């Protein structure tokens, strides 16, 4: 049939809950994550209320086709979720207790500015469009909101699974819509980042700095240029592990700065050679001697500045 | 039943509207984008007209099987859309208000000539094939054409979501077809393009220009050729965030020009060495001294010419 | 029900037509292409004959389950097509006019020997298996064979969409099968192939040829070997663009020849050094001087020979 | 109908059994694997009991819709399994022998710390949610738990397929849930890892150690830096064989250590040159002479330490 | 209804036949191959027998739901086949002639030890589980086993499509199962392997051998190490068209040997330099002179040993 009628003039309250069973396929590029969970729904339908000591027990079961069920959808899913109704139970008062198991690919924007020290809030937005007969409003039953303890996303610490109790009620295409924000909080657990990305990248840069204890222009050109190639090769090696964002990231700023340093090291190597060749070895020597301290110090300072700007 | 009959001899007007809920998976290579939206349909079916007084209730709800619904399809979709009828509402005059939520992978050609300063117009073409009994014509209800504020496509600014009100009515396979052009305007927001692509690429090129302050042929060969390798290695690194195109792009033209510059720098390095070896060091020195200014100037000029040609 | 009965002993003619709505996902590696088109079918089933006067209607509309429809399949599809019956129209003589919109991934062999100056004929084979009751034969209604003007395949010029009118009638597993060849002719458009693949590849090779104006064995080893690395790096860069083939392609023959040239250039560099070292500088000088003309000339000649062999 | 009623107040026991037909698509990155297996279910339903003599038959076959079947689901699947009921058989007492063939993509966490000498325990968790009328409990029929001998996962030795007989009975969303742990034990068989990964990687490192029999700073810089590039290039080559891991792996630790060794070799090469240049050739020579033994010994020592820490 | 009853105590014989329409998507990594074929089935069901005279025909057509059909499955498929019943024909004696068109992704292990001179036998295992009423046994109708002449797998010669007539009858989960082995024989046709992989790889190795006509340690270090980089770069280039295998392949053995040769060439270059430096130029010269013949000879010999050892 159609929606339940109101006692007075009130909207229908659909008590919702989401219990996370599985979390997988967090795609950093697509900004999507796959979820496998329970969706619990509860609402009052008077037309279904019954007498207990006349019925032979206290709670009866229905098929989805037999009764009216609210049309709940998710806002930020790519395709409609794959759902399987687990159970429908009517208490004597007429309260319906719906339960389904669903899997869905959820689109939630990600902010990689602080990579690999970034935290994310993954959203699952529940929605219900009000009907002509009556208005439908979503609510949160906190007893029904949780997550399985072994829920995992490799590379992340799963912080919390909560819901913003107060729904976002608004008008859309001339009709009322009640929205619910379910939040999955995750923070990045990237340990190997140091021995995998930073450390070998810094060793290559440090090798270039040995050109400050050499006067051989040929040896210096080989040091600075070949390390620059090794650095680029190393990025090609590590690119897989990085964000690929249209905005500047923290790790990306360090990498950019390392490119600047190779350029400055070339200028020095070039300058030192020109001065030597132009019979000014005292200046060439003082510049090289300064560079030995200037390069690490300016590097360390600029990194402190960067860290400060990002955090 | 079959389509509603005409009052006179007029075609049936189906008032359409698309409201963008989500936009995702813009594939630059496939020239496709995924969309999750509402499709609203409106027409008049006199056969469904009712007396609100005798019926008591002012709007009646129907199941898709119960009434006639026009067969609306999308022209530029890979497979048929995944749709879910949200609501069907009938008013006393026989006005039908249809609403469905659909997801679809839309094929729309992209023009990368101005990358990364390119703008795109994504198309969603609505179509209806006329029946034997009467002709069907599409129309645009602008109240029903919009987009959710949260609608995002990482790397792009979502400009507008509009529809070309005037349908494209034409004959096909001996029947009338009424087409509607819905347009999603996007412009690229690639800030990080400068520190990610251009700047490190220019530093490598600038390093090869240091061969103009050196007389060592061995050091110069290492500078020019090793930077050329570094440049190629760098492009392999950035390959991913450059579009694969059968036509010349703006970024592609800069990159091609940088390859030409490495070739010219080799010629110079070669020429300077030959002259020195052929006991003409005055010419060798004047060419190298000129190159120091010629190379940056000719580069800067050619880039101005390129920018002008593309914009 | 079962198939329509013959007036005499004649086969049933199914008039077919394919109208290309869209063409996408041409996979050069898989030798597959995706298509979205109309399939029109027309046959006479007298059992459906009606009196327009008695029925009140001039044309009767049926559901696919209501009437007999020939089992048309495609030979060269990955999985069965995704079809959506648009319309079934019966005229009083019993002529059925069927129309469906379908999407399918078609397997059609590709010949890359002339890449990037290759043209392809993409096939879509329609088939019908005859029944015991009567033989079924396919036919082409040319009024119903076409393609939308907007039909595109990035990197190709869509030449024509035609059908070989004469069906291929043959026996298979003790029954008659009537086959139809629909052909989509495409020719490659790769304007950017010259500035993207050939030109930078030729510049690298030309850099190696500068070793013919040098006597420094160390500088020459660096020129030849570093260019060889740059060439390999460049090919890894263009890998994607080139097709992966178990046969020799035109572009592939050029690339192979460029590898041979690097080897010959090494031999020269090696020979010139040995002669100089073995106190024969007059020969070393004459070989190097010859190489300056020999290398470009032999290269240009071998390319003319290759072009001739392939075209 | 609804669930079978209890004789007393006992829960319903569903005897389960999974027989592995095929194992494929072990995705090291996704931490998923695909499975094709039989799912056997057994329970007693008194309502189905029959006298074989009066009925004439020893066994009765039913359609899934005809009888009550428990709702068994898998916990750690991406989407619901693709199942096909093979057979349903009832014995005179009301015992039901259910059998289905299913395929499913299973999510099971993987531990790469000991790669390539790692072993994995793959989990397939069976679950049943209890109903209002009676509690449902899962059990293991070991006669029905097995695997086809042909079962393979390229690169692994399939050790065992077993089930933890004792179910995990617990409460969830106000109802009892009975869980079963099916375990597939696999151990990696990567022999080709030595000639494919380690040996060529060690040869490159050993080439860098030849700088200890050279006094040419230019030759030494080329040896150390060019091998460092070759090492990075080699890792890019083998990157596909190694997994993306947020934790340090054994192979990962060796690779990190090899990066440290290239850095130390640079320091030595740099130190030896500075001492020579600073007119201390006796120290330079003694350091280089020590390095010849120090480098292999410290390397061999640190690898023994690493192996010990990981095993 | 249920299965046909036996005349005497015999099992039911299901005559099978597979006719290959299309072969595509041979995935060397997944060890899977996609196939599009006809599956013909034939068995006797007396319940369906008729006198052609009284019943009004010779043969009659049934719907799959109307009659009993044996449950034939494939053992080595990832998911259940996509099948479409083409025809069901019952002859006067009750001989059922079933025909369906199916597509399936078939898992068949591959042996890359002889790559690219390998041959493969692709298996399609047909199976039937016996019922309580009677045992079911599979048989091969050779008239119904074939393949379309157009059947292709790019890079392979399709040798034969046959079936091992004698089924594999065995017990599983307390019931009889009858298995059939259908074999697709393919042999690799990788012509372009020589100019694409071997030849450029050998040229790089040969370039390293020029260090045997040089006394310049700096030039030699550049030759050996830069070619080693070029070799690795070339392997990254050919990575794609080489088997990723947990076992040693023929090509893999050649490639490993090439890595060993670069290491030995380094030792020589190192030895020759040390002897020269340690005032023993006569030995240095004799070693270098020997290596000129030793290297090609030992290489050519080891390749003959390998070839032999593998074929």
List Cβ neighbours of C182 (8 Å cut-off, separation of 6 or more): C18, C123, C124, C125, C126, C145, C161, C162, C163, C164
CA distance C123 to chain E (A): 12
Considering D131, D157, D192, which residue would you say is the last residue of a domain?
D192
By DSSP bridging, strand E119-129 and strand E82-90 are: unpaired
Contact (CB<8Å) C217/E213: no
3-class secondary-structure state, position C63: coil
Q: Of E36, E89, E152, which is closest to C109 when you measure between CB atoms?
A: E152
Contact (CB<8Å) B263/C218: no
Chain A CB contacts of B198 below 8 Å: none
Q: How many CB atoms lie within 10 A of CB A69?
A: 19
Chain A CB contacts of D253 below 8 Å: 195
Place of tokens 């060749």: A277
Q: Which residue from D minimizes the CA distance to A154?
A: D246
CA distance D85 to chain E (A): 10
Token pair in block for residue E264: 């030995």
| Shared-domain flag, residues A173 and A211 | no
Q: Which residue from A minimizes the CA distance to D79?
A: A103
Place of tokens 């879509």: C124
| Shared-domain flag, residues B139 and B197 | no
CA distance A69 to chain B (A): 13
**Do the Cβ atoms of C132 and C4 come closer than 8 Å?**
no
Distance CA C256, CA C276 (A): 31
Chain B CB contacts of C200 below 8 Å: 256, 259
Distance CA D24, CA D162 (A): 18
Order the strands of the C156-172 sheet from edge to edge: C72-74, C119-129, C175-188, C156-172
Cα C68 to its chain centre, rounded Å, is: 36
**Ramachandran angles phi, psi of C210, nearest 5°:** -70, -15
Contact (CB<8Å) A2/B61: yes
Q: Of D103, D148, D223, which is closest to E221 when you measure between CB atoms?
A: D223
Q: Where are the alpha helices (DSSP H) in chain D?
A: 52-55, 193, 199-208, 217-238, 250-277, 281-310
Contact (CB<8Å) B263/C206: yes
Distance CA D308, CA B234 (A): 40
CA distance E251 to chain D (A): 12
Q: How many CB atoms lie within 10 A of CB E169?
A: 14
| Shared-domain flag, residues B143 and B278 | no
**Do the Cβ atoms of B18 and B163 come closer than 8 Å?**
yes
CA–CA–CA angle E249, E252, E255 (5° rounding): 160
| Shared-domain flag, residues E178 and E211 | no
Considering E172, E192, E212, which residue would you say is the last residue of a domain?
E192
Contact (CB<8Å) A214/D273: yes
CA-wise closest residue to E64 among E41, E85, E39, E35: E85
**Do the Cβ atoms of B306 and B250 come closer than 8 Å?**
yes
CA-wise closest residue to D172 among B64, A145, C101: A145
Q: Where are the alpha helices (DSSP H) in chain A?
A: 52-55, 193, 199-208, 217-238, 250-277, 281-310
CA-wise closest residue to C161 among C5, C12, C2, C23: C23
3-class secondary-structure state, position B50: coil
Q: What is the DSSP letter of E246?
A: S
Token pair in block for residue B181: 């052009």
| Shared-domain flag, residues D182 and D237 | no
Q: What separation, in Å, do the N-terminal and C-terminal C-alpha atoms of chain D show?
A: 57
Task: Look up the CATH number of the domain holding residue A252.
Answer: 1.20.58.390
Contact (CB<8Å) C192/B236: no
Please state whether B104 falls in left (phi above 0), alpha (psi between -120 and 50) or beta: beta
Q: What is the DSSP letter of D115?
A: T
Neighbours of chain B (3+ CB pairs under 8 A): A, C
D185: burial class by Cβ within 10 Å (0-12, 13-18, 19+)?
middle
Contact (CB<8Å) D154/E259: no
Distance CA E217, CA E229 (A): 18
Chain A CB contacts of B196 below 8 Å: 252, 256
Q: Which residue from B minimizes the CA distance to A234?
A: B237
CA-wise closest residue to C35 among C142, C112, C124, C117: C124
| Shared-domain flag, residues C60 and C123 | yes
Query: Cis before residue B116, ω within 30 degrees of 0?
Result: yes
**Do the Cβ atoms of E42 and E51 come closer than 8 Å?**
no
CA-wise closest residue to E86 among C78, C96, C175, C170: C175
List Cβ neighbours of A133 (8 Å cut-off, separation of 6 or more): A2, A3, A5, B57, B61
CA-wise closest residue to C203 among B236, A225, B266: B266
**Ramachandran angles phi, psi of C212, nearest 5°:** -85, 0
Q: Which residue from B minimizes the CA distance to A171?
A: B148
**Do the Cβ atoms of A248 and A111 come closer than 8 Å?**
no
Distance CA A113, CA D267 (A): 35
Q: Which residue from C minimizes the CA distance to B258?
A: C200
Contact (CB<8Å) C273/E22: no
Token pair in block for residue D299: 């390397």
Longest alpha-carbon distance in chain C? 112
Chain B CB contacts of C199 below 8 Å: 256, 259
Chain C CB contacts of B263 below 8 Å: 203, 206-207
**Do the Cβ atoms of E196 and C252 come closer than 8 Å?**
yes
| Shared-domain flag, residues D45 and D88 | yes
| Shared-domain flag, residues E151 and E236 | no
| Shared-domain flag, residues E236 and E261 | yes
Range of the domain at D239: 193-311
Place of tokens 């050649």: E254
Q: What is the resolution of this structure in A?
A: 3.0
Token pair in block for residue E37: 């074929």
3-class secondary-structure state, position B45: coil
Distance CA E256, CA D194 (A): 10
Residue C44: how many CA atoms within 13 Å on its side-chain side? Answer: 10
Q: Could you give the number of structural domains in chain D?
A: 2
C-alpha torsion sign, points D2, D4, D6, D11:
negative
Contact (CB<8Å) D206/E131: no
CA distance E272 to chain D (A): 11
By DSSP bridging, strand A32-44 and strand A12-27 are: antiparallel
Cross-strand pairs, A180: A126
Cross-strand pairs, B72: B128
Order the strands of the B119-129 sheet from edge to edge: B72-74, B119-129, B175-188, B156-172
Distance CA B309, CA B289 (A): 31
**Ramachandran angles phi, psi of A70, nearest 5°:** -65, 145
Q: Which of E20, E37, E196, E292 to mutate to test the interface with C (most CBs of C within 10 A)?
A: E196
Chain C CB contacts of B273 below 8 Å: 213-214
CA distance C131 to chain E (A): 8
Place of tokens 């520190």: B195
Considering B152, B176, B192, which residue would you say is the last residue of a domain?
B192
What stretch of H or E contains E41? strand E32-44
Contact (CB<8Å) E132/D61: yes
Contact (CB<8Å) E192/C252: yes
Distance CA B273, CA B254 (A): 29
Q: Of D71, D173, D233, which is closest to A19 when you measure between CB atoms?
A: D173
Q: Of C19, C203, C210, which is closest to B270 when you measure between CB atoms?
A: C210
Chain A CB contacts of B218 below 8 Å: 218
| Shared-domain flag, residues A158 and A221 | no
CA distance D170 to chain E (A): 31
Contact (CB<8Å) A247/B219: no
| Shared-domain flag, residues C236 and C102 | no
Q: Where are the alpha helices (DSSP H) in chain E?
A: 52-55, 193, 199-208, 217-238, 250-277, 281-310
Q: How was this structure determined?
A: X-ray
**Do the Cβ atoms of D182 and D127 come closer than 8 Å?**
no
CA distance C191 to chain E (A): 25
CA distance D99 to chain E (A): 10
| Shared-domain flag, residues B184 and B198 | no
E116: burial class by Cβ within 10 Å (0-12, 13-18, 19+)?
buried
**Ramachandran angles phi, psi of A50, nearest 5°:** -150, 165
Distance CA B73, CA A231 (A): 52
Long-range contacts of D252-258 (CB under 8 A, 24+ apart): D252/A192, D252/A195, D252/A196, D252/D115, D253/A195, D253/D306, D253/D310, D254/D198, D254/D303, D254/D306, D255/D201, D256/A195, D256/A196, D256/A199, D256/A200, D257/D299, D257/D302, D257/D303, D257/D306, D258/D201, D258/D205, D258/D231
Q: Which residue from B minimizes the CA distance to A218?
A: B219
C-alpha torsion sign, points D262, D263, D264, D269:
positive
Q: Which residue from B minimizes the CA distance to C86?
A: B71
Long-range contacts of D47-52 (CB under 8 A, 24+ apart): D47/D1, D47/D4, D47/D5, D47/D94, D48/D90, D48/D94, D48/D96, D49/D92, D49/D93, D49/D94, D50/D90, D50/D92, D50/D94, D51/D92, D52/D92
List Cβ neighbours of C14 (8 Å cut-off, separation of 6 or more): C41, C42, C43, C70, C72, C128, C136, C137, C138, C139
List Cβ neighbours of A49 (8 Å cut-off, separation of 6 or more): A92, A93, A94
R_g (Cα) of chain C, nearest Å: 31
Q: Of C232, C259, C274, which is closest to E213 when you measure between CB atoms?
A: C274
Q: Which residue from E minimizes the CA distance to C74?
A: E21
Contact (CB<8Å) E247/D214: no
Task: Look up the CATH number of the domain holding residue E88.
Answer: 2.70.170.10
Chain D CB contacts of E78 below 8 Å: 22, 24-25, 34, 36, 103
Distance CA D56, CA B226 (A): 90
Chain B CB contacts of A267 below 8 Å: 210
Distance CA C75, CA C83 (A): 15
Q: Of A101, A103, A234, which is closest to D232 when you measure between CB atoms?
A: A234
């Amino acid at each position: 049939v159609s929606p339940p009628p109101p006692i007075a003039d009130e909207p229908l309250t659909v008590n919702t809950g989401i219990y996370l069973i599985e979390s997988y396929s967090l795609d950093d590029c697509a900004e999507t994550f796959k979820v496998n969970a329970f969706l619990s729904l509860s609402w009052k339908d008077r037309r279904l209320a019954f007498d207990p000591v006349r019925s032979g027990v206290r709670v009866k079961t229905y098929e989805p086709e037999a009764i009216w069920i609210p049309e709940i959808r998710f806002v930020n899913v790519e395709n409609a979720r794959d759902a399987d109704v687990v159970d429908i139970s009517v208490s004597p008062d007429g309260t319906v207790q719906y339960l389904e198991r669903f899997s869905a690919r959820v689109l939630s924007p990600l902010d990689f500015r602080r990579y690999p020290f970034d935290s994310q809030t993954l959203h699952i937005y529940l929605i219900v469009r009000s009907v002509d007969t009556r208005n439908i409003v979503l609510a949160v039953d906190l007893e029904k909101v949780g997550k399985n303890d072994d829920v995992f996303l490799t590379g992340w610490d799963i912080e919390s699974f909560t819901a913003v109790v107060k729904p976002a009620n608004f008008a859309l295409e001339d009709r009322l819509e009640s929205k619910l924000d379910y939040q999955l909080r995750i923070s990045r657990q990237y340990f190997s980042y140091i021995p995998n990305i930073i450390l070998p990248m810094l060793f290559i840069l440090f090798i270039s700095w040995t050109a400050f204890w050499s006067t051989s222009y040929e040896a210096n050109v080989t040091l600075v240029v070949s390390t620059l190639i090794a650095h680029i090769a190393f990025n090609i090696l590590v690119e897989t592990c990085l964000p690929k964002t249209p905005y500047m990231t923290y790790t990306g700023a360090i990498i950019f700065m390392i490119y600047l340093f190779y350029f400055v090291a070339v200028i020095e190597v070039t300058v030192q050679h020109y001065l030597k060749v132009e019979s000014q070895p005292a200046r060439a020597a003082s510049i090289t001697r300064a560079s030995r301290i200037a390069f690490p110090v300016v590097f360390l300072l600029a990194n402190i500045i960067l860290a400060f700007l990002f955090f």
